[PDB]
């Protein structure tokens, strides 16, 4: 999943009075100040794109309400129950939270209500054999060995499309079964031909 | 610290380095890292797929001998957690084990921790993939007995097709 991940927080140390309200400041300033160390709980190998420059933006409002967004490609674990495959469905999670700070230090909230706090672009679908039916947004708690933590979770609901695996296995298998059943209409004395049907159909089904 | 049997590994770096630094008033330091590592596990496959493998992570100090650094497992046998939650698709973790010892090198002795898992393979996939075609082809091969001797073409086609199917099962197994 490719995301613009936006965070915002108050920082009383970074209030100012100046000619302009919000400083659309360079992304270099992100390293000079404290920022949340948000990490993805189920992420495997995520990429923070930095072509041509680190794809982050930081803005400081006059009151001190910092906004800070970054461009990421996160690949995360989506455990699957393949009992009903290819006619199954999945709810892939996307869960993130502070790595170092517990509940008593940093707490995560949604910018708007959870339904509209996560938005998917209309053309943003690189899914070949899946249909993204929708998303459900929630928050929860995790009690790690270091302490308590707040984990913000989204669940993307996906339904597998059946046409590919139909053409892959079901149609060839059905045609093979009909081909085997064709043997009944031959004469009983055509032993080599009927044996050829039987063995060839067995081999095809084995493959 | 380093991992002796590590092939390739990295510390997660999104949104930042998944690292934790906590200082307590008594001078205690807690240092956490989210690490993904691919570690070598030498697998004995003579009993494959009805096998039982033993894979170990090998934590060791590189530059400091036992005179400088002493490893230990914090919390004893309760140190390693979350193993019970893992459901591998092929394997199942029969048990896990923690060991602490000292390993001797030319430079000197060093502390050593070992975290081992005893994985046991599941046979359902192999039963569906390799075995069951083999038995069913074996029953297929015996149909030639019930055909008359004079009908040579039928029995020959049956035998040759059974041999071909055994060979293609074997090669589609050994390819992977």
């Amino acid at each position, epitope marked *: 999943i490719d995301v613009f991940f936006r965070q915002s927080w108050k920082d009383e140390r970074l209030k100012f009075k100046g000619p302009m309200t919000v400083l659309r400041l360079n992304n270099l300033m992100a390293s000079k100040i404290w920022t949340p160390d948000t990490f993805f709980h*189920n992420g495997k190998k995520s990429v923070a794109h930095n072509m041509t420059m680190p794809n982050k933006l930081l803005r400081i409002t006059e009151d001190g309400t910092l906004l800070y967004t970054m461009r990421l490609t996160v690949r995360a674990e989506c455990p699957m129950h393949l009992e009903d495959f290819p006619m199954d469905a999945h709810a892939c999670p996307l869960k993130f939270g502070s790595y170092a700070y517990t509940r008593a230090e940093v707490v995560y909230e949604w910018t708007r209500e959870p339904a509209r706090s996560v938005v998917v672009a209309e053309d943003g679908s690189r899914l070949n054999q899946y249909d993204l039916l*929708g998303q*459900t947004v*929630d928050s*929860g*708690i995790v009690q790690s060995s270091t302490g308590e933590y707040v984990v913000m979770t989204t669940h993307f*609901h996906l339904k597998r499309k059946i046409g590919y695996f139909v053409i892959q296995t079901y149609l060839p298998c059905i045609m093979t079964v009909i081909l085997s059943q064709v043997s009944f209409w031959l004469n009983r004395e055509s032993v080599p031909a009927r044996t050829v049907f039987g063995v060839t159909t067995v081999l095809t089904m084995t493959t | 610290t380093y991992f002796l049997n590590d092939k390739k590994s990295f510390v997660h770096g999104v949104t930042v380095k998944n690292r934790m630094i906590r200082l307590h008033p008594d001078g205690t330091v807690l240092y956490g890292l989210r690490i993904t590592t691919t570690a070598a596990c030498m697998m004995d496959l003579r009993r494959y797929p009805l096998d039982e493998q033993n894979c170990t992570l090998e934590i060791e100090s590189y530059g400091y001998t036992t005179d400088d650094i002493e490893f230990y497992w914090r919390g004893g046998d309760k140190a390693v957690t*979350g193993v019970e939650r893992i*459901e591998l698709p092929q394997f199942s973790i029969v048990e896990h084990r923690l060991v602490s010892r000292n390993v001797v090198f030319a430079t000197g002795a060093y502390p050593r921790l070992s975290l081992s898992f005893r994985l046991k393979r599941n046979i359902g996939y192999f039963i569906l993939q390799t075995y069951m075609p083999s038995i069913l082809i074996t029953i297929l091969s015996w149909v030639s007995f019930w055909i008359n001797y004079d009908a040579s073409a039928a029995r020959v086609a049956l035998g040759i097709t059974t041999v071909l199917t055994m060979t293609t099962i074997n090669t589609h197994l050994r390819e992977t």
Partner: nanobody
Framework: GSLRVSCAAS????????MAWFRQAPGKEREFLAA???????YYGDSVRGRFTISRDYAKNSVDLQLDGLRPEDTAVYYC?????????????????WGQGTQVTVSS
């Protein structure tokens, strides 16, 4: 008063499934109480947030709910469910496995 209710599974390992609790009062629909995920992640309903605590023992394949600070209108039959959350994690329709239900009553 305080209470603890356990829910043990059998015939199927639910280590990879989401295990949740629901409440049914007389004359009301099913209400979601709490849920625990494979990653030891806890979700709680607003009506019972901060009071009830959900835990999962993966070794013996069970989910436990610890109820504290009971108040009289919490009397109801409590159901234990396990399943993968599709369109859900808060809706009863997303779960396929359910318990027979245990009655709970509070006397004033």
């Amino acid at each position: 008063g305080s209470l603890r209710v356990s829910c043990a599974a059998s015939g199927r390992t639910f280590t990879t499934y989401i295990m949740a609790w629901f409440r049914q009062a007389p004359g009301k629909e099913r209400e979601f109480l709490a849920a625990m995920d494979q990653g030891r992640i806890q979700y709680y309903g607003d009506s019972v947030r901060g009071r009830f605590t959900i835990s999962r023992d993966y070794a013996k394949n069970s989910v436990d709910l610890q109820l504290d600070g009971l108040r009289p209108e919490d009397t109801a039959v409590y159901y234990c469910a396990a399943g993968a959350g599709f369109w859900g994690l808060r809706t009863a329709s997303s779960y396929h496995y359910w318990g027979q239900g245990t009655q709970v009553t509070v006397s004033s």
